[PDB]
């Protein structure tokens, strides 16, 4: 339908945040990662604040500082989505209000793992109505759960400001059903290693962490599959998944940071008392870079 | 084995009230698949044929009729797997003698066999029959989840020529396709035919092709030939039909639609529930909207 926010289509990097040794934000490194994504990966958008290991119990003051820097550095060059969930509802509202005042024009949220569908719906609709901003839902509204039902999607998509969904589990029957039932909503693939089969089911783009270093190939897959070049897209998805297979066996986030540094980006190391990367994983990351990205 | 590519119906079998085979109706279902659905092949003795609900002798009679009626007009695969390896070899030898040129076998289930035992099972059927083998992988029913390196171990056997892939794991599907470009991969999930096709599967084996095989071949061919937009529209229409089939009872609704198409599709094996008035009328509406 013509009412879709079609300008939002494309490849979004789940923005990696670098940290200093003491745990604070490496603001200079963060600006380098933003610039690398915009200028070298050529991403269509940035997805800021997704919950990972190092992201989760960081202070909201540091969450806010990441949001300020990201929109200051990106300006209006790419689309932005700010994830403001994974915290209590009143906390998520004050964060949604803050990023809205900063100028973010689209929110996303996943709920905390405390549950009933009425509580999920109220969580989303509260953020929307208290911030006045647009909202991308998650297909799985918390971690240890499963994808929502088709009629639950309808309850949420009844809200005009709930404009799309990040699809995080690869149920491709449900993905087809959601695409058919809501042609006016955006669907973003959350699974980088399944971008090609998602693209032919009509997803509007993809949100992923590997696009920080593999955004060029990802954009090629998306574009070729939508323009009658499926054989070429499949070969690039094959190459991409050789890289992803190695990234996954070597530790996803620590390997992305190592390859960023091999590309000259001051990405540091994984934060917190999160497990230190090993000498063997350092060497494997170097081999992955030489073979796939150098 | 490139000549085996394409769309295979998992052949349904009509049973009488007492569970015995309705031979007249079985020939009618075969004729409908070959002549009207225009399938490239028949997958005989699979889950869809209620294979695991019937006796060894009843399985043999289904295999006899199917190849007698189909002759060499379409490809034929005979599913001979079982928890009983001695039965699997017996059935595999029997259908090989009948003239079937390719076997399939579900992973042995119920007991928690480890992978070395699963490998012995496949290699034993191949060794004892001399026939080709397609791995039947269906974790939703068996609980057996096979790794990429485990597929590699099985695929070192030159007569294990492919896999019927029913796990909805499209990362694993892409990894198997890349690792084994010389093997056949058949999609087992009719409602995900389009995404599987663009990952390079060689065909599909499905229950809904007994009645929706025309659209299935369209999706497959269009997606391989730079018509993705058209293939998605037909997958969308197909999945409206499949969504109704699933809500109405899969086996009962396919058999009911076959009857609306003039094919005597008989009953399901007990304890499969008999179809209800509500389900009969729903099937009539699916037929009128999607297939008449």
Does residue B215 contact residue B238 with C-beta atoms inside 8 Å? yes
B189, β-bridge pairs: none
Give the tokens for residue A144: 């240890």
Q: Write out chain B residues lying below 8 Å of A173, CB-based.
A: 168, 189, 191-192, 239
Displacement of CA B191 from its chain's centroid (Å): 14
Is A155 marked as a binding-site residue? Answer: no
Q: Give the integer Cα–Cα distance in Å for B198 and A224.
A: 12
What is the DSSP-derived secondary structure letter of residue A54?
Answer: T
Give the tokens for residue B49: 């044929």
Provide the 3-class DSSP secondary structure of residue A163: strand
Q: Write out chain A residues lying below 8 Å of B175, CB-based.
A: 241, 245
Provide the 3-class DSSP secondary structure of residue B268: coil
Catalytic residue among B43, B94, B132, B136: B136
Q: Give the integer Cα–Cα distance in Å for B112 and B8.
A: 30
What is the widest separation between alpha-carbon atoms in chain B? Answer: 51
Please name the residues in contact with B198: beta carbons below 8 A apart, sequence gap of 6 or more. A196, A197, A200, A225, A230, A233, A234, B223, B228
A82, β-bridge pairs: A48, A107
Q: Give the integer Cα–Cα distance in Å for B52 and B83.
A: 10
User: Is the alpha carbon torsion for B21, B22, B27, B28 positive or negative?
Assistant: negative
Distance from the Cα of B226 to chain A's closest Cα (Å) equals 5
Q: Give the integer Cα–Cα distance in Å for B123 and B155.
A: 10
Resolution (angstroms) equals 1.8
Q: Give the integer Cα–Cα distance in Å for A271 and A285.
A: 18
Give the tokens for residue B269: 């094996």
Q: By what technique were these coordinates determined?
A: X-ray
> CA B285, B289, B292 angle in degrees (round to 5)?
100
**Which of B200, B226, B239 faces A228 most closely, judged by CB atoms?**
B226
Burial of residue A195, with CB atoms counted within 10 A of its CB: 0-12 exposed, 13-18 middle, 19 or more buried:
buried
- φ, ψ for residue A118 (rounded to 5)? -60, -35
Provide the 3-class DSSP secondary structure of residue B63: helix
User: Is the alpha carbon torsion for B48, B52, B58, B59 positive or negative?
Assistant: positive
Does residue B151 contact residue B180 with C-beta atoms inside 8 Å? yes
Provide the 3-class DSSP secondary structure of residue B188: coil
Q: Give the integer Cα–Cα distance in Å for B218 and B216.
A: 5
- List residues of B whose CB lies inside 8 A of any A CB: 168-171, 174-175, 177-178, 189, 191-192, 194-196, 198-200, 223-224, 226-228, 231-232, 235-236, 239-240, 243
Does residue A121 contact residue A154 with C-beta atoms inside 8 Å? no
Note whether B192 contacts A200, CB cutoff 8 Å.
no
> CA B256, B259, B263 angle in degrees (round to 5)?
135
Q: Give the integer Cα–Cα distance in Å for B216 and B205.
A: 10
Q: Give the integer Cα–Cα distance in Å for A55 and B170.
A: 28
Give the tokens for residue B204: 């599909």
Q: Write down the H helix ranges in B16-114.
A: 23-35, 56-70, 85-98
Note whether B224 contacts A201, CB cutoff 8 Å.
no
Q: Write out chain A residues lying below 8 Å of B196, CB-based.
A: 197
Catalytic residue among A12, A19, A138, A253: A138
Does residue B31 contact residue B214 with C-beta atoms inside 8 Å? no
B185: nearest Cα among B164, B160, B155, B206: B164
Displacement of CA B5 from its chain's centroid (Å): 14
Residue A166 parent element (H or E):
strand A162-167
Burial of residue A116, with CB atoms counted within 10 A of its CB: 0-12 exposed, 13-18 middle, 19 or more buried:
exposed
Q: Give the integer Cα–Cα distance in Å for B211 and B208.
A: 6
- Do β-strands B160-165 and A186-189 pair in parallel, antiparallel, or remain unpaired? unpaired
| Residue whose token pair is 């030898």 | B93
Domains of chain B listed by start with CATH number: 1-292 (3.20.20.70)
Distance from the Cα of B228 to chain A's closest Cα (Å) equals 7
Give the tokens for residue B109: 């289930």
Distance from the Cα of A201 to chain B's closest Cα (Å) equals 7
Q: Give the integer Cα–Cα distance in Å for B110 and B126.
A: 22
Please name the residues in contact with A267: beta carbons below 8 A apart, sequence gap of 6 or more. A16, A18, A29, A32, A33, A256, A257, A258, A260, A261
Q: Give the integer Cα–Cα distance in Å for A38 and B188.
A: 41
Q: Give the integer Cα–Cα distance in Å for B106 and B47.
A: 9
What is the DSSP-derived secondary structure letter of residue A274?
Answer: P
- List residues of A whose CB lies inside 8 A of any B CB: 170-173, 176-177, 179-180, 191, 193-194, 196-198, 200-202, 225-226, 228-230, 233-234, 237-238, 241-242, 245
What is the DSSP-derived secondary structure letter of residue A148?
Answer: P
CA distances from B155 to A213, B80, B181, B201 (A): 34, 19, 11, 16
**Which of A171, A202, A234 faces B168 most closely, judged by CB atoms?**
A171
Please name the residues in contact with B191: beta carbons below 8 A apart, sequence gap of 6 or more. A173, A176, B238, B239, B242
Does residue B140 contact residue B166 with C-beta atoms inside 8 Å? yes
Q: What is the dihedral of CA B150, B155, B159, B160, to 10 degrees?
A: 50
Does residue B49 contact residue B62 with C-beta atoms inside 8 Å? yes
Please name the residues in contact with A121: beta carbons below 8 A apart, sequence gap of 6 or more. A155, A156
What is the DSSP-derived secondary structure letter of residue B21?
Answer: B
Q: Where are the beta strands (DSSP E) in chain B?
A: 6-10, 41-44, 75-79, 103-106, 133-137, 160-165, 184-187, 203-206
Nearest-10 crossing angle of helices A150-157, A172-181: 40
Tally of CB atoms within 10 A around A38: 20
Interface contacts A/B by beta carbons within 8 Å: 81
Looking at chain A, which residue has its C-alpha nearest residue B176?
A: A238
| Residue whose token pair is 């297979």 | A245
Q: A34-39, long-range: CB within 8 Å, 24+ apart, which pairs?
A: A34/A69, A34/A70, A34/A73, A34/A74, A35/A73, A36/A212, A36/A260, A36/A263, A36/A265, A37/A13, A37/A211, A37/A212, A37/A215, A38/A74, A38/A77, A38/A78
Q: Give the integer Cα–Cα distance in Å for A160 and A155.
A: 11
Binding-site residues of B for aceneuramate: 47-48, 166, 188, 190-191, 207
Note whether A173 contacts B232, CB cutoff 8 Å.
no
Give the tokens for residue B157: 């056997």
Catalytic residue among B164, B217, B255, B259: B164
Does residue A105 contact residue A134 with C-beta atoms inside 8 Å? yes
Tally of CB atoms within 10 A around A251: 19
A138 catalytic per annotation: yes
Q: What is the DSSP string of A194-243?
A: GHHHHHTTT--EEEESTHHHHHHHHHHHHHHHHTT-HHHHHHHHHHHHHH
Q: Give the integer Cα–Cα distance in Å for B51 and B87.
A: 13
A272 catalytic per annotation: no
Give the tokens for residue A97: 């209000």
Q: Give the integer Cα–Cα distance in Å for A204 and A136.
A: 13
Give the tokens for residue B292: 């008449």
Does residue A207 contact residue A190 with C-beta atoms inside 8 Å? yes
Distance from the Cα of B48 to chain A's closest Cα (Å) equals 20
Q: Write out chain B residues lying below 8 Å of A225, CB-based.
A: 198, 228
Q: What is the DSSP string of A63-98?
A: HHHHHHHHHHHHTTSSEEEEE--SS-HHHHHHHHHH
Note whether A242 contacts B191, CB cutoff 8 Å.
no
**Which of A176, A196, A226 faces B199 most closely, judged by CB atoms?**
A196
Task: Note if the bond before B271 is cis, omega within 30 degrees.
Answer: yes
Distance from the Cα of A268 to chain B's closest Cα (Å) equals 30
């Amino acid at each position: 339908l013509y009412k879709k926010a079609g300008f939002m289509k494309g490849i979004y990097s789940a923005l990696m945040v670098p940290y200093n040794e003491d745990g604070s934000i490496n603001e200079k490194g963060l600006r380098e990662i933003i610039r690398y994504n915009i200028d070298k990966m050529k991403v269509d958008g940035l997805y800021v604040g997704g919950s990972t290991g190092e992201n989760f119990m960081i202070s909201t003051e540091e969450k806010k500082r990441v949001f300020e820097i990201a929109i200051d550095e990106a300006k209006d060059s790419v689309n932005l989505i700010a994830q403001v969930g994974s915290i209590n509802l009143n906390e998520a509202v004050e964060l949604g209000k803050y990023v809205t005042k900063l100028g973010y024009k689209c929110l996303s949220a996943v709920t905390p793992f405390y549950f009933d569908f009425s509580e999920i719906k109220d969580y989303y609709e509260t953020i929307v109505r208290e911030t006045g901003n647009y909202m991308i839902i998650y297909s799985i509204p918390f971690l240890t759960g499963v994808n929502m039902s088709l009629s639950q999607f309808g309850e949420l998509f009844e809200n005009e400001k709930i404009i799309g969904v990040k699809f995080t589990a690869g149920d491709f029957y449900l993905l087809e059903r959601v695409r058919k039932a809501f042609p006016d909503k955006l669907i973003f693939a959350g699974f980088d290693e399944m971008l090609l089969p998602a693209t032919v089911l009509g997803v509007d783009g993809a949100i992923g962490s590997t696009y920080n270093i593999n955004g060029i190939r990802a954009k090629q897959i998306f574009e070729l599959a939508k323009n009658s070049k499926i054989d070429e897209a499949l070969k690039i998805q094959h190459t991409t998944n050789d890289l992803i297979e190695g990234i996954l066996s070597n530790g996803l986030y620590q390997t992305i940071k190592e390859i960023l540094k091999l590309e000259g980006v001051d990405a540091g190391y994984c934060r917190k008392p999160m497990k230190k990367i090993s000498q063997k994983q350092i060497e494997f990351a170097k081999e992955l870079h030489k073979k796939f990205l150098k």
